[PDB]
CSV table of C-alpha atoms in Angstrom, one decimal:
chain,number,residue,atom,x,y,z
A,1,UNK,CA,76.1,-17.4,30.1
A,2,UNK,CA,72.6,-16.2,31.3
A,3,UNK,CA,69.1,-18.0,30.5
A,4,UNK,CA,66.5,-15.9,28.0
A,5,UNK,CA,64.2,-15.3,30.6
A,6,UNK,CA,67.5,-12.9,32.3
A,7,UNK,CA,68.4,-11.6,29.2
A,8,UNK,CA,64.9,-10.5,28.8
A,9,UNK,CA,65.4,-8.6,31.9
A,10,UNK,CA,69.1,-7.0,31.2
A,11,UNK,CA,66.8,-5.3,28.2
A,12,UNK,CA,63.6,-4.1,30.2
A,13,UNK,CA,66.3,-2.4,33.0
A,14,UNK,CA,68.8,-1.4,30.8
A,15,UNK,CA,66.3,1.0,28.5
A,16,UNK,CA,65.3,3.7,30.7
A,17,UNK,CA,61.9,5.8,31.7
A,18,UNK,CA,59.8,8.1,30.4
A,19,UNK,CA,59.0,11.2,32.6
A,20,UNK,CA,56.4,13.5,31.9
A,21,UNK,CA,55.0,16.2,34.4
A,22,UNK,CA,51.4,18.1,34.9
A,23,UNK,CA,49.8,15.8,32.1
A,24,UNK,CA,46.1,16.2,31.7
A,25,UNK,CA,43.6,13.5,31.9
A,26,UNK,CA,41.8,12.6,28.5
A,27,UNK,CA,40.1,10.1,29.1
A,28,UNK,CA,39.8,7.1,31.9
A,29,UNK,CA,38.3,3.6,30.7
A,30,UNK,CA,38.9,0.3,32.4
A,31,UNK,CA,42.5,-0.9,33.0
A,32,UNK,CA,43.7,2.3,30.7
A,33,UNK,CA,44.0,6.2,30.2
A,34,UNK,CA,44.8,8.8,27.5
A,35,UNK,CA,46.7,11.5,28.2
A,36,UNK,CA,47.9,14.4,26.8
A,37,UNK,CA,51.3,15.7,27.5
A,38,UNK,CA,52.5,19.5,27.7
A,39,UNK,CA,55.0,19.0,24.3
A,40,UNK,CA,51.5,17.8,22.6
A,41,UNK,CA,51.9,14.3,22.7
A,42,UNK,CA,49.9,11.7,23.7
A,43,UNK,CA,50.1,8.5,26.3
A,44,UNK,CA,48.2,5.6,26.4
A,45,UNK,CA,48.7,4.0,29.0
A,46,UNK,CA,47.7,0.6,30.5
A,47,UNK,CA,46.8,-0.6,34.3
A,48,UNK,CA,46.6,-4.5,34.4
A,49,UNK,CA,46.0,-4.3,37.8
A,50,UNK,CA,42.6,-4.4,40.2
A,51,UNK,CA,44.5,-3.2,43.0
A,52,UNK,CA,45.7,-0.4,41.3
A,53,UNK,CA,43.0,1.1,38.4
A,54,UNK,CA,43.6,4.8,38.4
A,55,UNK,CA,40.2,6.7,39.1
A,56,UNK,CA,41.4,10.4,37.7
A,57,UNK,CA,38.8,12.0,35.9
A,58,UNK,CA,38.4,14.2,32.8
A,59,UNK,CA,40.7,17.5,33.0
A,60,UNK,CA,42.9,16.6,36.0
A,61,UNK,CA,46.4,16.5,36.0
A,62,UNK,CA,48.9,14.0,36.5
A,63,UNK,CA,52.4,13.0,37.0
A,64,UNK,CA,54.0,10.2,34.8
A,65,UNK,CA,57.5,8.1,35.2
A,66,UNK,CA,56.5,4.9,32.7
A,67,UNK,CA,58.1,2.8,31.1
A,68,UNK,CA,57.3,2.4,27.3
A,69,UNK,CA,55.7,-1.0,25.9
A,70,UNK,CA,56.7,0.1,22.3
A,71,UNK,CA,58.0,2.4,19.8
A,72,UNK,CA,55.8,5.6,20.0
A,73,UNK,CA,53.5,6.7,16.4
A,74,UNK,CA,53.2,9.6,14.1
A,75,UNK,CA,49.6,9.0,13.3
A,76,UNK,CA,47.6,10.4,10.0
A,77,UNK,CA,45.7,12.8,12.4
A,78,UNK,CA,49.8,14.4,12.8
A,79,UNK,CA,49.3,13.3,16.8
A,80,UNK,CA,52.4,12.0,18.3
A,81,UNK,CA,51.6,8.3,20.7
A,82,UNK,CA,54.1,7.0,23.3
A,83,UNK,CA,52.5,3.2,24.3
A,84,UNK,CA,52.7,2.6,28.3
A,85,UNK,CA,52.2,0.8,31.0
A,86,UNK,CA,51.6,2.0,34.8
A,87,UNK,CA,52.8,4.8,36.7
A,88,UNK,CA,50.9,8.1,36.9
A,89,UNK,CA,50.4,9.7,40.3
A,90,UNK,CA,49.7,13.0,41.1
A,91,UNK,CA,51.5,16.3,40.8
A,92,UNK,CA,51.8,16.7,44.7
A,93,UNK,CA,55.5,17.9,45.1
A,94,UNK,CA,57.7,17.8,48.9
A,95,UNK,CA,59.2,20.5,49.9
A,96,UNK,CA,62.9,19.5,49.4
A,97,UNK,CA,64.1,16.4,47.3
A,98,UNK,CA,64.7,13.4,49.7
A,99,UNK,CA,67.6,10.6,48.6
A,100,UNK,CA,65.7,6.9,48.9
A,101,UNK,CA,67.4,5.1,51.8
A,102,UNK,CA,68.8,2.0,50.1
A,103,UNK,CA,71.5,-0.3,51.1
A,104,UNK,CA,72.7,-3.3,48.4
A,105,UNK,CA,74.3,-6.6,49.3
A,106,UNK,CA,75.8,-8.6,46.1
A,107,UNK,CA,76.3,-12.2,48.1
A,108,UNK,CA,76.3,-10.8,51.3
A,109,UNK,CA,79.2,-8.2,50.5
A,110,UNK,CA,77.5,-4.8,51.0
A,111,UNK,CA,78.1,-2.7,47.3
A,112,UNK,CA,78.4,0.6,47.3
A,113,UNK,CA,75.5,3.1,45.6
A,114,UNK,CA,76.8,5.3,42.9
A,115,UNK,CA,74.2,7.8,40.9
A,116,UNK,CA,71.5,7.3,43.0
A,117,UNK,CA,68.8,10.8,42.9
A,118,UNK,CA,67.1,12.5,45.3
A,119,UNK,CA,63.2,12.2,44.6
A,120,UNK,CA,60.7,15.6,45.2
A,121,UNK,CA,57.6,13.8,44.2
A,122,UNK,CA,55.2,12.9,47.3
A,123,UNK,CA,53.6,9.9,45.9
A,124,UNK,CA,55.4,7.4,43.3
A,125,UNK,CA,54.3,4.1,41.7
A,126,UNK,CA,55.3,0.6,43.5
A,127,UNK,CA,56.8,-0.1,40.0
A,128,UNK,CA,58.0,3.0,39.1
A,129,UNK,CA,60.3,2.2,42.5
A,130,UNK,CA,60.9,-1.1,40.8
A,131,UNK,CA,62.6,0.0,37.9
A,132,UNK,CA,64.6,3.2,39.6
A,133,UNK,CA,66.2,0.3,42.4
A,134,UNK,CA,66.9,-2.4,39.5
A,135,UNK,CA,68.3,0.0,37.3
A,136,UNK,CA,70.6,1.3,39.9
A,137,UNK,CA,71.6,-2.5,40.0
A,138,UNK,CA,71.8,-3.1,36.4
A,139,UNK,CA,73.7,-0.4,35.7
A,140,UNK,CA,76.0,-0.1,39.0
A,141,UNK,CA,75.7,-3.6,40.1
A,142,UNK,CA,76.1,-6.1,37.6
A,143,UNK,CA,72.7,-7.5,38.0
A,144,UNK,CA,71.7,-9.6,34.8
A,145,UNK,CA,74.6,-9.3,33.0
A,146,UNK,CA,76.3,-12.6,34.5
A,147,UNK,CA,75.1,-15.9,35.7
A,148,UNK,CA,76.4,-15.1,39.2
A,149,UNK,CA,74.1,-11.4,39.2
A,150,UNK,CA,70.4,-13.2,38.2
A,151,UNK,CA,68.5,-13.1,41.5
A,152,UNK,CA,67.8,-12.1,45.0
A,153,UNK,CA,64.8,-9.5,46.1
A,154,UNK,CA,64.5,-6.0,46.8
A,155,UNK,CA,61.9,-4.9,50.2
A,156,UNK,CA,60.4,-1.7,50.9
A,157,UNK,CA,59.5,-1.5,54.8
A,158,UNK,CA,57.1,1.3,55.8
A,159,UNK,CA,57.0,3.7,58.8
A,160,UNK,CA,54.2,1.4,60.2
A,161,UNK,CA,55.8,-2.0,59.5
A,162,UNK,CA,54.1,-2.2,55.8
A,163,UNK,CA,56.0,-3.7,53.4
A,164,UNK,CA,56.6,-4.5,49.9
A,165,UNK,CA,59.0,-6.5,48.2
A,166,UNK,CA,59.8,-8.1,44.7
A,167,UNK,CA,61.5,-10.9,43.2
A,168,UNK,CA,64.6,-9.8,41.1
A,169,UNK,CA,64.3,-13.2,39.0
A,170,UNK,CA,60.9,-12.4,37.3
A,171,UNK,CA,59.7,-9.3,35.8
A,172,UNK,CA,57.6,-6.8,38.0
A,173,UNK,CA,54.4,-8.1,38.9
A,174,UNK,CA,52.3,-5.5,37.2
A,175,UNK,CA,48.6,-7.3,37.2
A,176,UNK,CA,49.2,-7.3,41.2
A,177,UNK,CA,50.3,-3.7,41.4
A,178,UNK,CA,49.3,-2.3,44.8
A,179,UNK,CA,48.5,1.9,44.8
A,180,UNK,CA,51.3,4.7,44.7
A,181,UNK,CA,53.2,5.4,47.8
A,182,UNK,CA,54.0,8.3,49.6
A,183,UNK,CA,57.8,7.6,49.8
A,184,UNK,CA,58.4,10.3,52.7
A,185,UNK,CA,56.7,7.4,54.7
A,186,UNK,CA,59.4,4.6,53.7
A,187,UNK,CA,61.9,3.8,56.4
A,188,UNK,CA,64.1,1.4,54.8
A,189,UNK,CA,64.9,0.3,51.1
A,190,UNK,CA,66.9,-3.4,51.2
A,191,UNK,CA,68.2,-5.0,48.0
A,192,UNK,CA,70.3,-8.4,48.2
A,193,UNK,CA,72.2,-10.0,45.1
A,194,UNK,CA,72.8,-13.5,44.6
């Protein structure tokens, strides 16, 4: 028996991404953009954060690995909307896919990865790494889906000592959202279950 705020969370994880590649810029206003999508649709997406206001202009092209804040529209005009929030980098590619160095620890016990991809993109979204590491945990893990599995932290650690890290009880703090990364540069990925 979990609390709402968890079961609120099981939900968010649980419901996948939505990828789009070599998107083009629309438009660029304060804490949002409009894209357009190669299949013809288009994104809106928003950017609650100051640390982290994408300044892409007019005509450029972008990557996209979002997460949805709604069902998407078929408007009048015939234009088809998907309703986002955060992650769009750019289309910079490495040269071979790289697997994310993580290591999970469900009460100290050290769990096993299983179904856990290689990434070819150069630069990704702090919470576009959010949802990829706590759906690996949702969905391999256990986490959310009992009272034991409701907590703990994930941490990113840089080359140079940076790091980032996030509370697994509380949804991603988007309004803080630091820039993308370039996850060649991470040394270490640590996740810890309790």
């Amino acid at each position: 028996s979990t609390n709402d705020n968890i079961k609120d969370l099981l939900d968010w994880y649980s419901s996948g991404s939505d990828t789009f590649t070599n998107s083009e810029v629309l438009d660029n206003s304060l804490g949002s953009m409009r894209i357009k999508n190669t299949d013809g649709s288009i994104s809106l997406i928003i950017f609650p954060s100051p640390y982290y206001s994408p300044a892409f202009t007019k005509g450029e092209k972008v990557d996209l690995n979002t997460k949805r804040t709604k069902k998407s529209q078929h408007t009048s005009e015939g234009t088809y909307i998907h309703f986002q929030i955060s992650g769009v980098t750019n289309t910079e590619k490495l040269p071979t896919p790289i697997e994310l160095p993580l290591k999970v620890k469900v009460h100290g016990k050290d769990s096993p990865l299983k179904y856990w991809p290689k990434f070819d993109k150069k630069q990704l979204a702090i919470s576009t790494l959010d949802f990829e590491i706590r759906a690996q945990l949702t969905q391999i893990h256990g986490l959310y889906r009992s009272s034991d599995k409701t907590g703990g932290y994930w941490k990113i650690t840089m080359n140079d000592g940076s790091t980032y890290q996030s509370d697994l009880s509380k949804k991603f703090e988007y309004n803080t959202e630091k820039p993308p990364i370039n996850i060649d540069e991470i040394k270490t990925i640590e996740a810890e279950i309790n």
